[PDB]
Structures are given as C-alpha cells and as structure tokens.
Amino acid sequence: IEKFRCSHGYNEIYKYSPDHEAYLFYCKGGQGQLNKLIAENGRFM
Amino acid sequence: VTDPEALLLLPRLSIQNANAISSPLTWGFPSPGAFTGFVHALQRRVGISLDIELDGVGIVCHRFEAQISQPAGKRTKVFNLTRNPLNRDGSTAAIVEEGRAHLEVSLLLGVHGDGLDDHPAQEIARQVQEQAGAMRLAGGSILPWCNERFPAPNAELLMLGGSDEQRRKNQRRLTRRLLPGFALVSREALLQQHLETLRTTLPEATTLDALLDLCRINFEPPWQVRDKPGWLVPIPAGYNALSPLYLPGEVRNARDRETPLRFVENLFGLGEWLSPHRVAALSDLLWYHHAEPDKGLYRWSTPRFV
C-alpha cells in the first residue's frame, strides 16, 4: 500500500494516512517532488 | 570533607558579566571553582568574624544568558566583546576575547561552626548577604536587587532535624524555593564507567575521548541518535601540576611573596545539570575543595553525591 500518491494533472501529492483509510493532501508538486519524497520517507508505508 | 551543620541559602543572585570562558576547552557556565573560591572568599571575609566555617556550595542557576552571537551562515557562535581603551599613541589595542554572561544563580553553601549557637540564624544570614552584595562571582558584579517588588531574603536551614520527617519537610520547603533552576553536580564515576565501556568497545581509549563522546550528539546506523542520561556537560574539574612547587619568594612576578606557586593545567571532568528535587538530600550537591598538594591534583567535585 503506497505511502504517497501524486495526482498528476493537478500537481498535488497525497500522503496515505492510516487512521482513516484514505489519502490526505500533503503538498504540491509533481513527479520530481513525489520521487524526492519517496527517497526521503520510503514508499509502501 | 566534613558534613554541614546547617545549609544557608543565598537567594537568586544576579551576576552581570561572569566569565563565560570556563576553560580552554569549555565555554558557557563558569567553572565551579569560581563558586568554591567565592565561598572561600566569603569565609575569609566574614566567616572568621562570625566564628563559622562556610564550606561547600550548591549551584542552581535560575537563568543564564551568554553574550554570544551566532554569525550568518555558521553553526558556531562568537562572543560579544568590549571596546578597551586605546594605547598611548591612539592605536586600537590588540583585542583579547573575553566571554561575558548574565547569570541568575542561588548558592546553597554549607555552614558549620560554633557561631550558629552564638547568633540568630537570620542574623548571620543577613551578614553574609550584606557581604556578598559587595563581591563578585566569576568576574561579574553581583547585582543587589534594588527597588523591585520585594527582596529575596535568606533562610538558613538547620541541617540537624528533630525527625526524618521534619528534615524532609523543611528540605522540601527549601527545594520549592530554589526550584526554577537546575542544580549542577560532578559526575565523574559515570565518566569513568563510560571510559570502561568505550575501552571495551575499542581499546587504548582516553577518557578525553569518552568525555567528547558524552558531549557530542553521535548518530547510529539502524538512523537513531544516541540517548544521553540527563544533561551531561564538560566542566573543568580543577588543576593538575605541571611544575614542582616553588618557594614563596622564588618565582618571579607572583601575586604575593608569602605563598608557594606552581604552574598548573586544567583537568576536564564531567558534570550533570539536573533538577534539584531529584537528589532527595540537599546536604549533598555541594562543591568542595580537594587539593592533595604533594601530588598536584588541585580539584573540586561534589563528594557524597551518590
């Protein structure tokens, strides 16, 4: 289960939250900010 | 040394420009030797008149502010200096960096002697307070609390209690009074056993390196910082001999010619800033003088701590 989800056309990064079963808005940015956040935090929770 | 018969509390004392340079390796709070020498100067100036022996000192430090400034783009700090006068030609003199800091400490100094029975407790408390108002604590003037809301007075707690409960009760009363500070104690046994564990880790390790390891925030791989028990700091724990002890009228340009001189060098121990109600015995947490002059090793510590 992926920790971050980039909404691609809308330039928003959604980070998974475990309390409610959903993604919440983390920050703006595209694929580069998504990959940088994956490198920092690690994907797959 | 000997245990205190009473425990005088000098109140919150404001010191305006104390020596923030404790040692060649440490900056920050002044050396505990300043406080032990201050208490011995108090004994030298009123203790011979009130027939008491002021000995030992508990350092509390309600607030502290080093006159420092972090420069732009650096992680380190520098010291705000003073402007010394010019020379006889008008040239700017060579700047010698002195650290200055504003302290608010209170001194738990132990008192014992035959003067406790001769005078009232508030009388000798007011006497040593009126003497300490005209003194200096680490090179910094003692600010004497004029025209504020109310002067913080003294309370000479008698260490001899009628019970264990009365002893703990007025000890808790005193600890509530010196509560917004942080008591400074000498923790050399922890430094020694940290030397032993670090020598088990890699051999021929100095306790200089164990001290440095206890200071730094070192990181560990799985990343996690190393936990530290309490607020561990490096302190200068006295002096060690570099020279044979010279005769009084033998060394050139001494302070006086009736005192033997010996060129010495600092000894860096370890201290721990803890809240004062952790110790459960305020008869402890007092900094004494241990010379052993035949070997060198002029040092100060808090004996009877643990």
Next chain:
Amino acid sequence: ILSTASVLAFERKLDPSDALMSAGAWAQRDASQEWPAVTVREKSVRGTISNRLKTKDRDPAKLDASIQSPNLQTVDVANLPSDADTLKVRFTLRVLGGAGTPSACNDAAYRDKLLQTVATYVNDQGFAELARRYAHNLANARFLWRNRVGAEAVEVRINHIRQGEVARAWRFDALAIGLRDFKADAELDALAELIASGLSGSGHVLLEVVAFARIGDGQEVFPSQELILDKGDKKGQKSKTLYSVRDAAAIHSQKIGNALRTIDTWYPDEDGLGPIAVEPYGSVTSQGKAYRQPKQKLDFYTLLDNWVLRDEAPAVEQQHYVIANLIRGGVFGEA
C-alpha cells in the same frame, strides 16, 4: 503527428449548488418557502466493539476488558422535527454549454482537432441522450442519496428560472421514475430539451430543483458528511461532523453533481447493476470496483485518444460516455 496536448483542463458544465435541506409537513409543500431548516445538532453515542478481531485479541478476558472500557463519541446528527415528516432538499443547477472547448490547452493543433471532434459529435447527434439522462437523474431524486432509500413518497419540482421567475414548472413522482431505467415521458422530454438547449449553448438554463420526501416524523436525514480534525481526547471524540452552510444542514454541491452524472449504462460489465457515474476508468467508491479498466479499451482516456488523435470513432454509446466526461470536467493530460 498529433500527439495529445500536455495540458487540457475542461471546466465543469452542469454546476449544482449546495442542497439546503429543510423540513415540514406534506400536503403543504406548496407553502414551503418558510419551512424551517434541518439543523445539525450533536448527540453522544456509546458503542461496544463490533469490528473483527485479528486472532490475537480473541482472548475472552481481553475481550471483556475491552468491552468494559467502551467507546464514547459525540456525533453530528440531523433529524426532522417531531411534527414534520417531509424533507425538502432544494438546490439550483446551472447548465452551461460549450462542452468540448477546453479552458487550457498547449497544442493548438490538438485543440482544433478536439473541437472538430466534439462539433462532429454534436452535429451528428446533439446533447439529446445525455440531457435525457441528466433530466432523469433530476426527475428521480437520486441526489437524495440516503434520504430516498426508505421514503414513502418522493416528489421533485423543477422550475426553469428566467429573468426573475419561473418560466416553466415541472412536477415528478420520483419513485415511479426508477433509479435504473431511462424511459420516455412527455415532461421528461421537455426537461431533456431544456437541458439540451443549455448544453448546446443556445440558451441560458438555470433550474431550481426542489425534492420533497415522506420520511416520517422526527426521522433521521442524512446531509453530506465532512472530515474531522482528531486533535482531542477519545471521549469527546467527535467521530462524525456533518455539512451545514449557516445553521442549516446541507448536501455538498459535488455530491449532487455525482448523482446527476449517474448516467453511464454503457460500461462493459453487466448492465443489471444499473447506471454508474461518469468517471475516467468508470469507478464506484461504494463497490470499490473500477469498471472501464484500461486493460479493456473502454476507459475515457483510450477512447478519447482514439477518437481525437487517430480518428477511430467509438460506438455512439461510448462517445456519449466521452462527451459526458467532457461535460463533467477535469484535467486530462499528462505530466
């Protein structure tokens, strides 16, 4: 070569408003302009555990100790008054028109091709099936989401509002008109022609949609539900907050919009499951299943890219679906 434009943003046609739910008594729905609003108020719930245990918590002592410390929450609840059995859900809907024209587009050649494609669609067949299905989802009160499921009688009143007042009034039996069949009616075809003239840009269309539902005295109505802070303790937990605009319960505008778009009866799976909402990779959150998966060639993106770039026009049902996705709006274009 005509690649896809790197940006496309389509603005939302069929704009609804927040649906303000008020309450009153049936057989005086015609005097329902001063009906008091349904207020969202707080009640406090206390529940034992009923979720599944993960085979570790199945110790009976641990289970009894957990049910001895039960969960205290407060919840936002909205009910009808105890002397009122009808819920009035009233919103306005604007049908804008000019569906294929993007609000943003990098490639000018792709924009001309897309505009040619949508204009070819509209000239071959207007907004006549799409507006018929939108008029159905206005007629059967689907925008009453859970306020409809046990209602004794639902009735929808749709007024076309011209310069200041009603130009044409409709009145439907929203339970006779089903939630799953798009039949024909003399009044539904008139509403379909009105939404057709709105979507074709040939007129300004603003509808005022009012839906009354016989629920029962004091029963619970279900406004749209917000999401909660969770900054405080677990006894005044506030496990549920509801939407309200100004001391008056309400359904979100995009929930009304999602119920309006529920027209897609052309997905490749079984058609007895009813219409679903028009989405790319047409998905339903409640069922958790995405119909029109891109492995099959029937999502919005592969159909649009085959229709516009390489001119492979799909079947007329699938291009109804593509144009309903253009009416829905969104950003369709890569990174």
Next chain:
Amino acid sequence: ILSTASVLAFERKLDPSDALMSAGAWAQRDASQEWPAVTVREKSVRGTISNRLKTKDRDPAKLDASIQSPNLQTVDVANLPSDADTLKVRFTLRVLGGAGTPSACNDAAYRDKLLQTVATYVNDQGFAELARRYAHNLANARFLWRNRVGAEAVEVRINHIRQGEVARAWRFDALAIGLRDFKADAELDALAELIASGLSGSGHVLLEVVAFARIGDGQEVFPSQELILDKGDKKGQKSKTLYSVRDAAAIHSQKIGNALRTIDTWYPDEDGLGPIAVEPYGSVTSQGKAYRQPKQKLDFYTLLDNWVLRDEAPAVEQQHYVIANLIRGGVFGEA
C-alpha cells in the same frame, strides 16, 4: 476460493427516532397530543465521599478532612410535573427492508454469495421470528429503559402510518407482555406480519410508537444522558447533562434501537438471564461480559463466514441471530 470482502457496510434497518418524552395524567391519554413536554432543568447536589478507599485514605483524620469539604455539582434532572403521573414517550420507527444487500462491498463474488445466502434464508423462513421478537420489544415498553422499572401500568400504542393517517392501530398492556418471554397473541402476530412485510421489502412500514407509564406525581424520569466537557471549576462542574431536542427531554435513537434489538435468546450461556441485544460477540455493556465469544463458534463473524464462504449453514436460531445482525447494520469486513 471466495475469501471475505475487505469492506462490508450494512445500513441500519429499523430506524427509530429520538424518543420525545412528555407528561400528563392517565385516563386522558386519548387526548395526549397537547401534553407539555418534560423539561430538563438543573439542580444542585451536595455529596459526601462514599466510594471505596484504597488503604492510603483510611486514616481517620484524613477522611474527616475529606468529609469536611464536600463535592458540589449541578446536575440536569428531568421530573414529571407535580400534577402529572404519566410519562408519554413517543417516537417513530421506520422498517426498511433489503436486509441482505450491503451498502458497500469490494468483492462482487462475495456480494453475490452473501445475497444468495440471505435469499436462501428468506425463502426458507421469512422475517417471521425476527419480526415477532421486534414486535414484542415494541409491545413491552423495553425502550422505556429505567422509566419502566417502577411503573404501575405501562400501555404502548403503536400506529401504522399510511399516506397521512393511521392505517391500523394497536394498543398493548406492556406489563402483561413480559420482558423475557416471546409468547404469541392475536395482535402481536398482526404487528409481526407488518414488521415482516416491512423487512421483506414488500411494503412501506412507518410505525408511530407511543408508550405511557404510570410513574407518579413529580417522579423522576430518565432521558438519555449526554457526556460533558469537564472544563470548569469543582463547584459548578455540571456533572450530568441530559439529552433534549428543543427544550424537551428525549431518549437517544440508538438507545431505542438497542432496546428494540434485545431479541437474542440464542447465546450459549444461560437463558434465565433473558434476551440480550443483537451484537457481534453478543455483549451487554451493563454486565461487562461478552456472550458469544469467538473462542466458541457462536459470534456473528464466524457464523457468517461459515455460512457464506464454506456453506456450513448453522442452526436456524443462529441464522436468526446472523440475519438480525444484518438488520442491525454495522461495519463488517477486515483491513
């Protein structure tokens, strides 16, 4: 393979409302439509310390110093008026039907299998035992929770409300109908057939349930109790708040629903302890014990998973319990 669905949400069938409690005099209960509501008012209470001491407060001087300073509270209290001896508790109940369909379910295969299972149940034996037990819990005023325990005479009037008026009126003596035996009657079978046709989906059922109780002049009634914020001082604590909708005391809807669900006489422990409420891991929060623990194979989850997945149909009492849980609603399914 047919594993269990990851989400499973069942909507609540048998929706009650908030039970509004008003007050008046007996023998004019037939004119009880203008009866004034029971108002929740505040009063101060002054208590001595009476809880158990943990062998550190058993000093006599310390205990006397504690009882020298008593604790002050203001409590919300609800009494009848001094000229009214009857408590009228009135709510509506809406029986929906469609008990097998989940409102959210991931696996389509599990959803079809679960629908087939519930349809097999309904075809084999309809909602006939369950509706008889729900009709008893309407008939004996179990929803009067503590307002029933000292009442001289309890009378429940249940009215089937059609298009605007009463289609069929019942009238029960709720003390002759016990709280623990599900006997048979002439009128209770008519109410059971009505709740049966409601739960089967073959008709709209909305019942208006009115219950009267001879308590006594000025006696204390017991509405549902809210929880407090615990923010102010120890003198004006406001340690008790009672539920009220608009200056009118009320029992929560989930409390009336928990009293209606109290039909489960099939739990493996002793049946002299009465029916309990239908819960998975069937637990009574007053008693702190969970009957139908998962170490036995009689909770709702293992019964449902043996019935649906691996076709191990339980006894008809346990599947009465399972379909009663599906009528109850809930969030079933794992993570």
Next chain:
Amino acid sequence: AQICDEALQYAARLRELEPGWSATPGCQLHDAEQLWLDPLRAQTDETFLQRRLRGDWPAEVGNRFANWLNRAVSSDSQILGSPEAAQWSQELSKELTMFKEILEDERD
C-alpha cells in the same frame, strides 16, 4: 522522572514568574488545576480562595497528566495485551505518586 521534572519546572516558573494566571477572568481556565496560580489565589484573596485551596489541597493534576502521558505509548492491541503495558503502568504510577507527593506540599 524527567518529564515529571520539567512539568514541575514549567508549573514553578509560571507560578513565580507572572500574575497572568489571575490576570483576567471568564468561564474557561481549567480552574481545577490550582497549581499554576499558587500566589495568585492566596496573596490576593485572603479567605476566598486561600481557604478554598489549603483545605481542599488541589493536587489532582497527576491523573490528568497521566491521561496526557498515556498517549505517549502506541495504542497497539499487542502492546496492551503484553506485560509491557503492565510495566509501563506501574512505573508511571510510581512517578505520578512522586508528582503527587511533591504537588501536595504547596501550603507550607
């Protein structure tokens, strides 16, 4: 012990530093604490709040602080089922007992 230390430290520096705990009234100050306003209730009100605090001895902040400190451990079912929660609760009870023993003696 350290978190108790700095809680008592924060309370002491507020209670001696400012008269802001009795600066302006209202309805919401969580007034059951009565530790952050030690000279704000006795040095001003002679019998109104000082006799309402010396006989009552408001030291009840330990259980609310334990409720706040209970968040610090994770709310895991295996963590509560194991004996680590038992060790956590007994050491927490000892330290709140020491917080109680230091918090009670505020009238001397």
